[PDB]
Structure formats: C-alpha cells, structure tokens
Write a protein that binds this ligand. Structure first.
Ligand code: HEM
Ligand SMILES: O=[N+]([O-])c1ccc(O)cc1
Length: 137
C-alpha cells in the first residue's frame, strides 16, 4: 500500500527520485522552463551533475515526509502551505504539481513493482487540492 511504497522509495530514494523526475521532464518538455540549468542535457548527463542528484533527492525526501504525514493520502494543510510559501516555488502553479504526479503515477504503473498507483494518484490530486486551498494559483 501507500505506507509500504513510502518505504520502497525511501529505501533507494536517490535512484527513484532521479528516475521519476526524469520521467517528468521527458513527458513535459515545456516544464524544463522552471529548470534552465537542465536544458540541452540527456538523462545520463543530468545524473552526472552534483546538484541534479542532490536536489532531486531533497525534493523527494520532502515529498515522502508529506506523504507520510498524510491521512488516507490527504496531505496536511500545513505541509501544503509550506510548499506554497517556499521561495523556490515562487513562480509555480498547481499545474506543475499535477504534471509531476501524473508522471510519477505513470512511472509506478510501468514499473515491475507492486506500487499502489491508485493511492499515489489520489495523493497527487489531494495535494493539488491542498495547494490551491493553501493559496497556490
Ligand atoms: C510534492 C512535490 C514537491 C516537493 C516536496 C518539492 C520540494 C522541494 C525542495 C525540498 C526543494 C529544495 C531543494 C534544494 O534546494 O536542494 C525544491 C526546490 C525547487 N523546486 Fe520543488 N518540490 C516539489 C514540486 C516541485 C515541482 C512540481 C516543481 C516544478 C515543476 C518544483 C520546482 C522547484 C524549483 C524550480 C526549485 C529550486 C531550483 C531547483 O532546486 O531545481 N518543485 N522543491
Ligand atoms: O521533481 N521536482 O519537482 C524537482 C526535482 C529536482 C529539482 O531540483 C527541483 C524540482
């Protein structure tokens, strides 16, 4: 289920984080707009950059914290607020997040492993909803 998936991802968080973010970037090329430093680089090139691995993991670490504090895949309002208020999220809208989780759910489904995809799909939708309630456009 969801709780076990959190453990699966945390277990090899660096690898999963990179794979899923890369799936995101490749599914939605315009999204690289929020990432000028990743432009014009293959997946393997990106993985060779120190900040790519470091940032992607720190992103997914916070995502797993938010996921774990959730109740029935509903994130805490305060976690949503944190994500809205982060300086690094200045220019973002809920659409950026919607797309991230569409990619994440697609990755899970295509994976050999028994991820609870429906739960992550709900988590993504409920996070988007919470981001909106916490004031993200
Ligand atoms: C639940 C989903 C997300 C979580 C938990 C999250 C968390 C974080 C964290 C912890 C950082 C700081 C990383 C660091 O400084 O090392 C960060 C930075 C950043 N995030 Fe988010 N993030 C999420 C979704 C997104 C999405 C969907 C986008 C855009 C599509 C985005 C855009 C950025 C940008 C532009 C930065 C600063 C530059 C960079 O680190 O590449 N974030 N995020
Ligand atoms: O998955 N994400 O949204 C990310 C991943 C890496 C990063 O540096 C910023 C955002």
């Amino acid at each position: 289920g969801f709780k076990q998936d959190i453990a699966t991802l945390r277990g090899d968080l660096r690898t999963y984080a990179q794979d899923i973010f890369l799936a995101f970037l490749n599914k939605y090329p315009d999204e690289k707009r929020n990432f000028k430093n990743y432009v014009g680089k293959s997946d393997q090139e990106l993985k060779s950059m120190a900040k790519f691995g470091d940032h992607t993991e720190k992103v997914f670490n916070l995502m797993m914290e938010v996921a774990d504090r959730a109740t029935d895949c509903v994130p805490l309002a305060s976690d949503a607020s944190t994500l809205v208020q982060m300086k690094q999220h200045s220019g973002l809208t809920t659409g950026n997040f919607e797309k991230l989780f569409v990619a994440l759910v697609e990755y899970m489904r295509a994976s050999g492993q028994s991820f609870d995809s429906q739960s992550w799909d709900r988590f993504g939708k409920n996070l988007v909803s919470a981001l909106s309630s916490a004031g993200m456009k």
